[PDB]
Ligand binder design. Structure first.
Ligand SMILES: [Zn+2]
Ligand SMILES: [Zn+2]
Lengths: 218, 216
């Protein structure tokens, strides 16, 4: 159950229940206390997320418009697609990080010649920063971050799709575990919570790929 | 210890064993098959790391400027320095990743309108990708990648340098090890190799006192 919002660049943008309930809790927590910008941030963040998962989309269309919808799950955003070529990945993958990087580098320059001050925080400036992280972070050569499909790509035709998958996927698992060890060691929920997303995000890849391979190898 | 190479702008530039071992693996890999590429890459990487360690430098000179040495790793650079002005951390740390990032994003675009083919291998394109990974990789909160000098900072104020360094550095050794077990267990040299760079990278950052010698 998603809720229509509006279509941009010819792609349906939806809001998942999980995202709405999540948003509602945020909007509410932006009133139970005066955490004003916290709510606005969440909004900017996901607006930015939209665009990132849009660039990803575009470069993809120019390969097979399996792009039906685009729903925002509280953990970022997912662009509902279908079959994805193995010789188009490397592009579709970096596609999104470019967009959010460019957007971030521009809004960054401009947010030094003009911006909007809300209780001080310069929306323009703030954003560029986020886009920059969203751009750069999605480049760590690991899974589920774009840099994972990208690293697999560069590797694929040399280590075989499954092994080259496993490497990316393995490093995720690697990073996640360590992240956990310290989120669990300093008892800092968010660290922990994120370590789990990343990790099961990497594993969900080995599983499917792997299962698949076995099925192809008859 | 490492091996002297050459200096620039009055700063000694060295090459940690990390790069020698990595060199060695590449030289050997260029005999495993009729390479050109593996040698090419080592050069591209090296060049890209230099630039990464240059951005780190610039933003630094516009501050404390305390740049005495520069150790280069295929991962990044453990540019040995001292006092770090307030806001030089956060900045000097991300300074390098941005360079590596922009350089990578630029050459990436360009390498779709023009390139240089060496026995096939497209130099510009290749490059962009290394800088992108080299940029993105250094965002992992551990040593010696840049995401550690920055994690130390955010942490520092609540634990203090001496042990606040150990923490990040410890995170590295721990991360490394695990990664090793993976590379070791799946016989994937790459994991293994990086696993080593990382580790000895933490061993070399987790230092606090170093007694050298000089012959000028
Ligand atoms: Zn993405
Ligand atoms: Zn660096």
């Amino acid at each position: 159950y998603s809720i229509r919002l509006f279509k941009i660049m010819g792609i349906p943008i939806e809001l998942h229940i999980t995202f709405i309930l999540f948003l509602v809790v945020i909007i509410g927590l932006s009133i139970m206390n005066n955490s004003i910008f916290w709510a606005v941030l969440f909004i900017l963040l996901f607006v930015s997320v939209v665009l990132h998962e849009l660039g990803h989309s575009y470069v993809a269309k120019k390969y097979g418009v399996k792009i039906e919808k685009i729903l925002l799950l509280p953990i970022g955003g997912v662009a509902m697609m279908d079959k994805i070529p193995k010789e188009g990945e490397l592009r579709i993958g970096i596609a999104g990080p470019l967009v959010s990087f460019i957007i971030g580098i521009v809004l960054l320059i401009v947010s030094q010649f003009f911006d909007i001050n809300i209780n001080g925080y310069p929306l323009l400036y703030t954003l560029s920063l986020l886009n920059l992280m969203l751009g750069g972070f999605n480049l760590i050569p690991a899974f589920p971050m774009d840099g994972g499909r990208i690293l697999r790509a560069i590797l694929s035709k040399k280590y075989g799709y499954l092994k080259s998958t496993k490497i990316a996927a393995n490093i995720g698992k690697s990073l996640a575990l360590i992240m956990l060890l310290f989120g669990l060691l300093s008892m800092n929920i968010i660290l922990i919570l994120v370590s789990l997303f990343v990790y099961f995000g990497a594993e969900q890849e080995s599983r499917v790929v792997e299962v698949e391979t076995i099925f192809k190898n008859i």
